């Protein structure tokens, strides 16, 4: 009815994760990767 | 001439014409309050040490104002553990003016 009055359906838009931004976010400083090891490296991992 | 009464959690010593800050009370800011319980009234012949309170003592006071106290800050920190948080706080109070101390 007006271009600045429409709204999305509730619960259809989730925020999304952002790693490595501070302490309060709960995802800074290793962003959920744990401590040292192969799986915590840029490009690390094993085959299928 | 002074008396001792037990307000909302603590005790105070007060005389006529004083202003006393208390905890929050659910009373409009124009009317009087009664403090039926008293602990001691003293003037020269100070012998009114009522054991569980006194017999005929009451205190007449009327509510002056309501408001919130001054903001304090809470900080929690744990060194080299990746943990901290902050929080504020302000406290409600209530002012009364003593108008009558009666034995």
């Amino acid at each position: 009815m007006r271009l600045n009055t429409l709204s999305p359906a509730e619960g259809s838009k989730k925020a999304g994760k952002r790693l490595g931004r501070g302490i309060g976010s709960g995802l800074g400083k290793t962003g959920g990767r744990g401590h040292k090891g192969q799986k915590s490296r840029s490009g690390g991992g094993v085959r299928r | 001439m002074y008396a001792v009464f037990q307000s909302g959690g603590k005790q105070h010593r007060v005389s006529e014409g004083q202003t006393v800050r208390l905890e929050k009370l659910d009373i409009a800011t124009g009317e009087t309050v009664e403090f039926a319980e008293v602990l001691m009234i003293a003037n020269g012949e100070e012998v009114k040490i009522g054991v569980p309170f006194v017999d005929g003592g009451v205190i007449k006071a009327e509510v002056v104002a309501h408001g919130r106290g001054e903001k304090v800050k809470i900080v929690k920190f744990r060194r080299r553990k990746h943990y901290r948080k902050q929080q504020g706080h302000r406290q409600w109070f209530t002012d009364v003016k003593i108008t009558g101390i009666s034995a």
């Binding site: - | 005790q11 001691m40 569980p52 920190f77 901290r84």
Partner: protein, 117 residues
């Protein structure tokens, strides 16, 4: 969609330094030191909010004990006698009475001494 960080960072830095006025030396001029100083001050204030309630009680006990022996009785016996007589007077009030009204304190002491009997 490039975003510059000048205004926001300057405001955030200025917020902290305004909380460190009066501190000695570099602890009120450079951010890296003022930050740690402010955090320490917060921790100390939180801890001291508890200790304040102990020092005053300690002081009240000392003053009551000093005033009670003027009338020939110890602190512990005085306090015990008050309880056997069913007297509920706060220690803060007792210290205030001891300082500012000797006669009322003497009346209290005599009542407690009689209560012990």
């Amino acid at each position: 969609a490039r975003v510059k960080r000048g205004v926001i960072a300057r405001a955030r830095h200025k917020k902290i330094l305004k909380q460190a006025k009066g501190y000695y030396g570099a602890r009120s001029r450079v951010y890296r030191v003022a930050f740690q100083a402010v955090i320490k001050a917060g921790q100390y204030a939180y801890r001291d909010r508890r200790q304040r309630k102990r020092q005053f009680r300690q002081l009240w006990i000392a003053r009551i004990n000093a005033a009670a022996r003027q009338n020939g009785i110890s602190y512990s016996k005085f306090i015990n006698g008050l309880k056997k007589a069913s007297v509920e007077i706060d220690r803060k009030i007792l210290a205030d009475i001891a300082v500012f009204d000797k006669v009322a304190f003497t009346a209290l002491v005599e009542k407690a001494k009689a209560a012990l009997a």
